[PDB]
Amino acid sequence: AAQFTVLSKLRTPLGRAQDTFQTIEGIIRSLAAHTLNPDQDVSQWTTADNDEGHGNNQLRLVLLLQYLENLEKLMYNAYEGCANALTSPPKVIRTFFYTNRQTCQDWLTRIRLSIMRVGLLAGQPAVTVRHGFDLLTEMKTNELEVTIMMVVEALCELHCPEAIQGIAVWSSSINLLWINSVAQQAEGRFEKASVEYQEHLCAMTGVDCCISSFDKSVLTLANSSPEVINYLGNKACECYISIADWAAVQEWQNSIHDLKKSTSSTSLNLKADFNYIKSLSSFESGKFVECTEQLELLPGENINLDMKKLLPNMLSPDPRELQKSIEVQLLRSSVCLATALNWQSITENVVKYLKQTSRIAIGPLRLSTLTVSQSLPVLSTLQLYCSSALENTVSNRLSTEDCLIPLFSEALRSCKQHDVRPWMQALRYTMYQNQLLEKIKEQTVPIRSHLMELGLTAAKFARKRGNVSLATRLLAQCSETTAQDLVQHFKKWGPELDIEKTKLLYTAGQSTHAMEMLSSCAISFCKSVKAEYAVAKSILTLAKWIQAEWKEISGQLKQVYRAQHQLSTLSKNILTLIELPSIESESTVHIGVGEPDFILGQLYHLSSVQAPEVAKSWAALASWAYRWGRKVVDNASXXXXXXXXXXXXXXXXXXXXXXXXXXXXXXXXXXXXXXXXXXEGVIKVWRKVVDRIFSLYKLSCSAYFTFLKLNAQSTDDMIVMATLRLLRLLVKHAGELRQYLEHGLETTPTAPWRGIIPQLFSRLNHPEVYVRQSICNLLCRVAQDSPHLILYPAIVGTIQAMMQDCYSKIVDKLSSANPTMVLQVQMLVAELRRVTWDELWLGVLLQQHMYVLXXXXXXXXXXXXXXXXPHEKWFQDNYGDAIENALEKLKXXXXXXXXXXXXXXXXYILRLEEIAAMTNTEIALPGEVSARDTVTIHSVGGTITILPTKTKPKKLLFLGSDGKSYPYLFKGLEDLHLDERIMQFLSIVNTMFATINRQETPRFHARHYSVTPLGTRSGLIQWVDGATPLFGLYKRWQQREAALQAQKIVPRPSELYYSKIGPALKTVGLSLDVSRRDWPLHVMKAVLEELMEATPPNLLAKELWSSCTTPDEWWRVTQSYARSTAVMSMVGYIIGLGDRHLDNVLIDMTTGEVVHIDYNVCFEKGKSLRVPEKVPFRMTQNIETALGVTGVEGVFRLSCEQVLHIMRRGRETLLTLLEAFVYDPLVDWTSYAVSVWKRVKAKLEGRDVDPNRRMSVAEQVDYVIKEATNLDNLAQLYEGWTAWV
Ligand SMILES: O=P(O)(O)O[C@H]1[C@H](OP(=O)(O)O)[C@H](OP(=O)(O)O)[C@H](OP(=O)(O)O)[C@@H](OP(=O)(O)O)[C@H]1OP(=O)(O)O
Ligand SMILES: Nc1ncnc2c1ncn2[C@@H]1O[C@H](COP(=O)(O)OP(=O)(O)NP(=O)(O)O)[C@@H](O)[C@H]1O
């Protein structure tokens, strides 16, 4: 319909071009006016004949908005155009829409204000958000506050506090301190938002309107225009209603009435049916008489004592009204059933009522599919589930498990992105059944456990968002206004309830009381029957809380330590917990280990022994032991004295004792030192002391091995860290603690080692004997049941005998299960290596022509001819006279003629038959690290394409069993060994975002491809599909502009830049012959400014908008793009990625994510070039506009801060991996690697640019953004970078 309207020059059956606009404008204005006053009763939009017409009204309202959205897109494409998103319309249409652009834009900006209200009414925040952003962008020259209000409300409905915060900062640069409060409410903090709203209202009116609430001192620690006043007043009521605080609602109503009567506002009025609120309060309080009496005033069919027309007339198409109607119907059914209990008397009519209610409640879920939303409504889903549960209990009389709401504790780890309202609705309908159980004499289903589970989960979610009052009420209900009250009232779900109470006490501010309660609870849990997950959780929580207050708790730990070798409540409790009866001695930790630090180790050991099935207990103990072991070993670089004195039957004894442990080939050095100092039983004491010093490493190794064995449950990020630590300790110290490493490696599984395989292969040249054997055995074992990860590396390596015997053994071991596969793999590798002739001859001739102006040339030519002796036959039959020509020219135009002929014949498409072809192959694809069900190669592409201007790349495709094509890129003489390390690093970084990705719609991810080297110079790189280069959009825009200007090729970036820098330099005195270094800064800034003003800054934004189908999809794609850009910007700045031109940045229109390809200018290599680069990442005009109206002030900055926080927390693993990359014999860095590692470490530690000052995450993000967005740095950049676009 939209296409027909645009293609007809707006001349539809509705009338002329103006009649259509007038009709749409009138309908939109009427609907918008009805939003302000819900009593307008718009004809054909608020009335229906039955319950089915009402759903149709909402459907029609959504369709109208979709039609307008498509019409605008088509008009824009008609007068401006796109780049592959939409097809160019005919010339006649383009000519008409180009001369009428002003009228079309004026009409749109004229109705944009009403469209936002209509979108807000229809429950489609995406429409109003997009329209608001478009309206704000045009406002570059009191309608500004209304737009901000609608935009903030829409963003609040979408649960996007980051965008709200960005908008607050953006608006602060134009009396808008109330936006932050809405941001707080968008995160689920209803208790704090109401207080902030009251504080703002008391200042915008001058009259105090506060109400009684929880202690404001601890509330903050746990987490003038009439329109603004009314908006804030209504939001406060909404916040109070969300947590179901009826008393607070009544108090707020009284306060609002008093404030209105004390200021004669005449415009401030709460828009909320209080009769419905009173009915809800009465129903929840158990007073069914008052509830049924109050329900008679609400609209709709009378309470049960036709079925199709249950909803009343004049109903607004607002989903909020539908939710209220459904709630009223549910309450009526519940009251009717309760009165009927005290089976077809009053059970026959209620079933039909509930069935109709359920049929109506599925409307919103159905509408959620018409628009690609990727998610279902939350309140609407629970309404339908509650109706189903009520229907089941009315017919089964609470006798089947289907009568309960399917809300369990499992939602704790899968629904962290939702507020507490769903739990409130579930609890409201569950308590009714619990109370109803008292009127059923027959057997029923146990609801007490379900109620306890729901209450505990609701309390946990309430505490996680600062709602102390709600959490207190829920905990009290489960247990059947000041912190002191909570302390005096709280100090299969027993242990969970106790731990939750302790956590709430800690959140309220009483850390000492919470610690004491946890200690008392742990002492009892350690003497329980099961206590599996209860002891570990309590001990780990107590240990974590102790580290927080390390300054105020260090004194107590010392006292408890001294008390053990011979006290407050917490100290005595800790003493009793560690002194419990069933491996760490004080002698091995009395050298450089702090006294309070030993208590933590004992606590970790106790947690690990009381719960051997918990992986967390082992990981914590292993980490603590490893850190202290490294510290004691670094710092160290009675029985012993008695043994030495007895075995040596005054200064000599002291010297010998000092030399025995001075700095412990070691045996020879010790013997020489002893002989030179004293002048053989010293070997026993020396061995005993060296073994005692390495006790921490042994304990850490045992704990790490146990943790890895328990993961054959825990995040892979921790697994990679443990494996890296074990490998590093085994490489560094191998002979001192070999007894543990040997057995552990011989018994450890092979699943947690699939992430450090390259490091294992790299450490195969260790200067030891059993170390190499152990690594080889581990790799051989990994090959079994998983040969797709050892096949290519072993085959390439086998194609210093230490680095050869291991590879041969691995290949032999892997060939014992499929010799045919190994042979085919070797044949394929050989064919690929030989498919890298004409190219060699051309290169040799070109090099000789330049190196000529003797015997070296003759020798090189002879070697090349000897090396060259389907495709080779043709080359030989066509140029076999080369040898004769070279021999005749030895005693020289033949070489020049051959080179010229080759160059002329060079100026792509090849065939596989002439350059063999297998089928039904069972070889793994080149790179299947993450593939549970590996796909084998099925065929090979019959054609090969050669990429021009980029050396000699070959695009080869591979067929799979899944009938899908997998493109690849073959490179010759590139040495892609370093790229593989970068790709592995990217995967390790992505590994740290697994936890945060479970409760965030826009996932934190860094797109990357696979790199498979095929030797020392060649390699196979994966091809990225679905992502287009950013330069394409600029090129298409240039072509469109040229075509438009032709009526009434395109220049290259260098040609366009010089054409402007020439006259500018000539107008000041200098000339083009002057060196680029000696160029005025003002001239460069002026040319950059002139170039930016000529290019449109919304190319990418418009392309992304035109690619999406619905507003919801547009919002999802925009958020995905912002988060991906932030993640890649921080990753690139941390590693030091450079050369970020338009051809190296790709964009996936399907999802909105970005992906980089070239990585040869990493590790700050772009800073030292002919034209140095001073920007950390690309933040040009087009990149910033695609982020929205606020730019880098909202989601981008916050996402960047989050990414930096995660990296700073997990920098240990990144540095460990980088160290391994540095010490790699297969990586060609050319102490450059040491400098690179130090630079990365400094950036990760926050000490990027500072002598001794350590910056913060926010400061670092701000500094990087400022350095990447300033015009002074973008002007003095290479012209090929295209800083103006
Ligand atoms: O109360 P719980 O249900 O046990 O929640 C805890 C804990 O919550 P609190 O910090 O509010 O006490 C943390 O939840 P998030 O921070 O991830 O939202 C997190 O612990 P940390 O972040 O402090 O490490 C995680 O525990 P963990 O990360 O160790 O798995 C989690 O669940 P569990 O404690 O049950 O594991
Ligand atoms: N993984 C990839 N996926 C898709 N396209 C790619 C990939 N890698 C490179 N390309 C593109 O395919 C071509 C490969 O040629 P390439 O050799 O990378 O260009 P180049 O000028 O030599 N830059 P460089 O790679 O640093 O030498 C270029 O046009 C790249 O933009």
Short mmCIF file of all heavy atoms in Angstrom, two decimals, residues 460 463-464 503 537 544 616, ligand 1:
data_model
loop_
_atom_site.label_atom_id
_atom_site.label_comp_id
_atom_site.label_asym_id
_atom_site.label_seq_id
_atom_site.Cartn_x
_atom_site.Cartn_y
_atom_site.Cartn_z
N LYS A 460 14.77 -11.61 46.98
CA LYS A 460 16.11 -11.45 46.42
C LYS A 460 16.12 -10.38 45.34
O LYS A 460 17.02 -9.52 45.32
CB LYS A 460 16.62 -12.78 45.87
CG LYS A 460 17.09 -13.75 46.93
CD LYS A 460 17.48 -15.08 46.33
CE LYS A 460 17.98 -16.04 47.39
NZ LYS A 460 18.07 -17.44 46.89
N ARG A 463 15.83 -6.91 46.96
CA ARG A 463 17.06 -6.46 47.59
C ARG A 463 18.12 -6.09 46.56
O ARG A 463 18.91 -5.18 46.80
CB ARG A 463 17.60 -7.55 48.53
CG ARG A 463 18.92 -7.18 49.20
CD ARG A 463 19.62 -8.39 49.80
NE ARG A 463 19.78 -9.47 48.84
CZ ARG A 463 20.77 -9.55 47.96
NH1 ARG A 463 21.70 -8.62 47.89
NH2 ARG A 463 20.81 -10.58 47.13
N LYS A 464 18.14 -6.78 45.42
CA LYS A 464 19.13 -6.47 44.40
C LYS A 464 18.92 -5.11 43.73
O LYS A 464 19.82 -4.66 43.01
CB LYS A 464 19.14 -7.56 43.33
CG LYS A 464 19.85 -8.83 43.74
CD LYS A 464 19.68 -9.92 42.70
CE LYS A 464 20.27 -11.24 43.16
NZ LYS A 464 21.68 -11.09 43.62
N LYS A 503 22.13 -11.16 54.02
CA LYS A 503 22.44 -10.29 52.89
C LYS A 503 21.66 -8.98 52.99
O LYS A 503 22.20 -7.91 52.70
CB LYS A 503 22.13 -11.01 51.58
CG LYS A 503 23.16 -12.07 51.23
CD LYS A 503 23.06 -12.49 49.78
CE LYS A 503 24.23 -13.36 49.38
NZ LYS A 503 24.40 -13.44 47.91
N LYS A 537 28.33 -21.57 50.20
CA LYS A 537 27.78 -20.24 49.96
C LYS A 537 28.01 -19.30 51.13
O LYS A 537 28.39 -18.14 50.94
CB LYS A 537 26.29 -20.33 49.64
CG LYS A 537 25.61 -18.99 49.48
CD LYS A 537 24.34 -19.11 48.65
CE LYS A 537 23.77 -17.75 48.31
NZ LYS A 537 22.77 -17.83 47.22
N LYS A 544 34.25 -13.04 51.21
CA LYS A 544 34.19 -11.91 50.29
C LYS A 544 33.87 -10.62 51.03
O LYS A 544 34.42 -9.56 50.71
CB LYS A 544 33.16 -12.18 49.20
CG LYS A 544 32.84 -10.97 48.33
CD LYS A 544 31.84 -11.32 47.25
CE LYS A 544 31.06 -10.09 46.81
NZ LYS A 544 29.66 -10.42 46.41
N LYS A 616 33.68 -23.81 43.07
CA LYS A 616 34.07 -22.48 43.54
C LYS A 616 35.03 -22.56 44.72
O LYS A 616 36.01 -21.80 44.79
CB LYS A 616 32.82 -21.69 43.92
CG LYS A 616 31.89 -21.43 42.77
CD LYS A 616 30.67 -20.64 43.21
CE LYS A 616 29.97 -19.99 42.03
NZ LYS A 616 28.97 -18.99 42.47
O1 LIG B 1 22.33 -13.84 46.28
P1 LIG B 1 22.71 -14.78 45.15
O2 LIG B 1 21.45 -15.35 44.54
O3 LIG B 1 23.56 -15.90 45.70
O4 LIG B 1 23.55 -13.96 44.00
C1 LIG B 1 24.95 -14.07 43.96
C2 LIG B 1 25.53 -12.66 44.13
O5 LIG B 1 24.48 -11.80 44.50
P2 LIG B 1 24.79 -10.58 45.56
O6 LIG B 1 26.05 -9.86 45.16
O7 LIG B 1 23.63 -9.61 45.55
O8 LIG B 1 24.96 -11.15 46.95
C3 LIG B 1 26.17 -12.08 42.86
O9 LIG B 1 25.19 -11.79 41.89
P3 LIG B 1 25.58 -10.81 40.63
O10 LIG B 1 26.56 -9.76 41.10
O11 LIG B 1 26.21 -11.63 39.53
O12 LIG B 1 24.33 -10.15 40.10
C4 LIG B 1 27.23 -13.02 42.27
O13 LIG B 1 28.36 -12.99 43.11
P4 LIG B 1 29.61 -11.98 42.72
O14 LIG B 1 29.23 -11.16 41.51
O15 LIG B 1 29.89 -11.06 43.88
O16 LIG B 1 30.84 -12.79 42.41
C5 LIG B 1 26.78 -14.49 42.13
O17 LIG B 1 27.75 -15.30 42.75
P5 LIG B 1 28.98 -15.87 41.82
O18 LIG B 1 29.46 -14.80 40.87
O19 LIG B 1 30.12 -16.29 42.71
O20 LIG B 1 28.50 -17.06 41.02
C6 LIG B 1 25.34 -14.77 42.64
O21 LIG B 1 25.04 -16.16 42.68
P6 LIG B 1 25.69 -17.26 43.72
O22 LIG B 1 26.36 -16.61 44.91
O23 LIG B 1 24.60 -18.18 44.20
O24 LIG B 1 26.72 -18.08 42.98
#
